[PDB]
Structure 1
Amino acid sequence: PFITVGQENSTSIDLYYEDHGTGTPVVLIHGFPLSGHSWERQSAALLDAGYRVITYDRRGFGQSSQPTTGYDYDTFAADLNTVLETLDLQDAVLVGFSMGTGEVARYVSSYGTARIAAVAFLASLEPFLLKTDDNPDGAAPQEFFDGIVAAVKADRYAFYTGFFNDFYNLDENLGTRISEEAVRNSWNTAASGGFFAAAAAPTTWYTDFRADIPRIDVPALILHGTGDRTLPIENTARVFHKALPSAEYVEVEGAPHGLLWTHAEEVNTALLAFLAKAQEAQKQKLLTEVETYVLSIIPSGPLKAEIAQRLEDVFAGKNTDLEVLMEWLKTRPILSPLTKGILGFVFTLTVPSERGLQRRRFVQNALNGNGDPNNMDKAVKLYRKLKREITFHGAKEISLSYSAGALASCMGLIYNRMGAVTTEVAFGLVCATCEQIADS
């Protein structure tokens, strides 16, 4: 699996990515000099929690193309964008490690959090590594980084074994937190990378991310190891924490630079919890958006308040008996049959348990669509499009092209188990239907 992110001479630049699972998309950007496969500890964890894990190898690393051009964060972010736009991700979370954290900041700063719901910085580079007079919070002077680049150019293969010695703190964690074989694999991964990328990448570590930080508006996470030798905790995460206090801050005690493997236990717990708070966030903003659309077709009165209250109760978690709600819904005066169907369709979607309750009769006759063959032909054509949809805004906006009668029929088409769409898509079809009714 590859994704063209550029062109070089006769050739085009491809980045080996990887997309698994189904649910909230979580993009994992690796660090130097590994590849997307280094996330395997997190990948397994995130997948078992029902997330959608998306990983890719940075240019000149892993199975990605190995160009001799474009090794700067403006390009690195531009690459990430192409990946995101190609996969058409929405409400996604960006998790970065080492160099990866730089990609996150630069992308957010330049392209904006349109597709992004939350971000995470593991072993951050931010805000500035280079130590200067105007930036005394810098970790190391220019000479340090120049020394690294020269060392790599000398013998990159020999450099790796020495490099990994401070990457995992092998004098402490080898044999205990990281096996001998595990390190051997990382070396091969480092060797598989491009020779040019290996020497070019170090120059990018001291990038000034200070201008990028203020652009971070989505909920963030800052995790870091105290025993990080490559990136000193005080010169990196703690000064980053000052520039971003709203971000959830986590310091793993005695963790080396490569905490993704050595301290996978702690990192996973913190990462999963952060995503959990974010997953509930993106779920709730959707439910309320559905609510406001549904209420927009109900005449102002004492009934509208109750319906809104009963929606809020199920949205929160105060699970009312689905049978009771439906019983209540059907026996409501001054309520359009079409409106009862829409509500019933929403309640079945939101209530966690179906409780073996068969499909309600008053809903079927409400969303039947006048029994007109033409309405159903339009509904089926729309259903085909809604099948390949995964996003709310995507499903909602393509549904607005169909007549209110076709939308009503397509809604019951899904209600009657004759059609299958993701919950987000279904909500989109509902909001699109309510939008048509609010016009007349």
Structure 2
Amino acid sequence: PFITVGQENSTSIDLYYEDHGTGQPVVLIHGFPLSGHSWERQSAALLDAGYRVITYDRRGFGQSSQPTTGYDYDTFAADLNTVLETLDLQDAVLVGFSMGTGEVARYVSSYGTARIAKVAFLASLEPFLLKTDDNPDGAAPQEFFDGIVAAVKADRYAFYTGFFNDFYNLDENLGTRISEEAVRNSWNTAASGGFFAAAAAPTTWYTDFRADIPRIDVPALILHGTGDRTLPIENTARVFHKALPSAEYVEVEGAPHGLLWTHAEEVNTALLAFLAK
């Protein structure tokens, strides 16, 4: 299925989406460099629990179009907006994972919560990963991001490999929590995203969501893996919770970045309890 969000030269920009089950609508917003398909462990539990599950592939990823434009949180938020309005979702739950948590903050902040019942942030970017003078808690200096960009441009194929190692803590989880086949599928999904999007995505990672946070109006859930090597729990989740005290917060003991797969359980159990309420 596709939803058209714009135009690029002679072609339109279409997002691949899926719409399963019946019940209260839950929209899942994937992380880099994956696709809506990465939520399969969560989707099955929500379907069983009796929710309507909406997944979509961000522009440049999985089965969506691969323009060379619109790689920024406002565009991504506007893309989300079009999906919501296209489907006329009411009383929806927005769940973002990694990059997806930037969409959740930015949409709520700009568009408001009229269609939105609750939000959930898993392995969040928030509040601001750039380490500055004004942002002391930031996870890295600008030079560091500039780094990743350079690495993806040099050979994103080879890049994906080192990325998944840390994404999943493979030195700990391989053959235990994650099969080699599961990791194979992940690399294939990434290799399938647009070359341009691959190098342009890392630049959206240090977007400042500090002014988005106060706008979160509806009940929220913050969930982070304490073994997160990709988004240090101390520069993210921990400072985010201070910014939104109100958020229900769950720490997944020794879970890596890729906790959707390695700790699907602990993830499903927090998720379903938070949505139950």
- TM-score by structure 1 length? 0.63
CA distance in 2 between partners of 1:41 and 1:144 (Å) = 32
CA distance in 2 between partners of 1:263 and 1:125 (Å) = 19
CA distance in 2 between partners of 1:9 and 1:216 (Å) = 36
Rg bigger for which structure?
Answer: 1
Q: Which residue of 1 aligns with 2:69?
A: 69
Query: 1:274-323 deviations in whole A, cap 9, x for unaligned?
Result: 1111xxxxxxxxxxxxxxxxxxxxxxxxxxxxxxxxxxxxxxxxxxxxxx
Query: 1:114-137 deviations in whole A, cap 9, x for unaligned?
Result: 100000000000000000111001
CA distance in 2 between partners of 1:108 and 1:174 (Å) = 37
CA distance in 2 between partners of 1:70 and 1:90 (Å) = 26
Q: Which runs of 4+ in 1 moved over 2 A?
A: none
Shift of 1:188: 0.3
The secondary structure found in structure 1 opposite 2:189 is: helix
Q: Which residue of 2 aligns with 1:232?
A: 232
CA distance in 2 between partners of 1:84 and 1:176 (Å) = 38
Q: Which residue of 2 aligns with 1:252?
A: 252
> Unpaired segments of 5 or more residues in structure 1?
278-440
- TM-score by structure 2 length? 1.00
CA distance in 1 between partners of 2:134 and 2:210 (Å) = 12
Shift of 1:187: 0.2
Identity of aligned residues (%): 99
Query: 1:318-344 deviations in whole A, cap 9, x for unaligned?
Result: xxxxxxxxxxxxxxxxxxxxxxxxxxx
The secondary structure found in structure 2 opposite 1:127 is: coil
The secondary structure found in structure 2 opposite 1:241 is: helix
Shift of 1:256: 0.3
Shift of 1:79: 0.1
Shift of 1:260: 0.2
The secondary structure found in structure 1 opposite 2:235 is: helix
Query: 1:67-93 deviations in whole A, cap 9, x for unaligned?
Result: 000100000000000000000000000
CA distance in 2 between partners of 1:140 and 1:230 (Å) = 11
Shift of 1:35: 0.2
Shift of 1:249: 0.4
Q: Which residue of 2 aligns with 1:195?
A: 195
The secondary structure found in structure 1 opposite 2:234 is: helix
CA distance in 2 between partners of 1:131 and 1:230 (Å) = 15
The secondary structure found in structure 1 opposite 2:176 is: coil
CA distance in 2 between partners of 1:266 and 1:126 (Å) = 21
Q: How does 1:384-399 map to 2 (within 5 A)?
A: none
Query: 1:10-49 deviations in whole A, cap 9, x for unaligned?
Result: 1110000010000000000000000000000000000000
The secondary structure found in structure 2 opposite 1:234 is: coil
CA distance in 2 between partners of 1:230 and 1:113 (Å) = 29
CA distance in 2 between partners of 1:193 and 1:64 (Å) = 8
CA distance in 1 between partners of 2:13 and 2:138 (Å) = 34
Q: Which residue of 1 aligns with 2:37?
A: 37
The structure that is strand-richer by fraction is: 2
> Unpaired segments of 5 or more residues in structure 2?
none
Q: What is the RMSD of the two structures over their aligned residues, measured on CA atoms? A: 0.4
The secondary structure found in structure 2 opposite 1:233 is: coil
CA distance in 2 between partners of 1:259 and 1:144 (Å) = 24
CA distance in 2 between partners of 1:247 and 1:47 (Å) = 25
CA distance in 2 between partners of 1:53 and 1:90 (Å) = 13
Shift of 1:145: 0.4
CA distance in 1 between partners of 2:29 and 2:274 (Å) = 17
State whether structure 2 residue 79 is matched by structure 1 residue 96: no
CA distance in 2 between partners of 1:186 and 1:6 (Å) = 28
Number of residues paired by the alignment?
277
Shift of 1:58: 0.2
The secondary structure found in structure 2 opposite 1:221 is: strand
The secondary structure found in structure 2 opposite 1:7 is: strand
The secondary structure found in structure 1 opposite 2:3 is: strand
The secondary structure found in structure 1 opposite 2:139 is: coil
State whether structure 2 residue 83 is matched by structure 1 residue 83: yes
The secondary structure found in structure 1 opposite 2:236 is: helix
The secondary structure found in structure 1 opposite 2:90 is: coil
The secondary structure found in structure 1 opposite 2:183 is: helix
CA distance in 2 between partners of 1:200 and 1:232 (Å) = 22
The secondary structure found in structure 2 opposite 1:190 is: helix
CA distance in 2 between partners of 1:141 and 1:45 (Å) = 39
Q: Which residue of 2 aligns with 1:174?
A: 174
CA distance in 2 between partners of 1:230 and 1:133 (Å) = 22
The secondary structure found in structure 1 opposite 2:117 is: strand
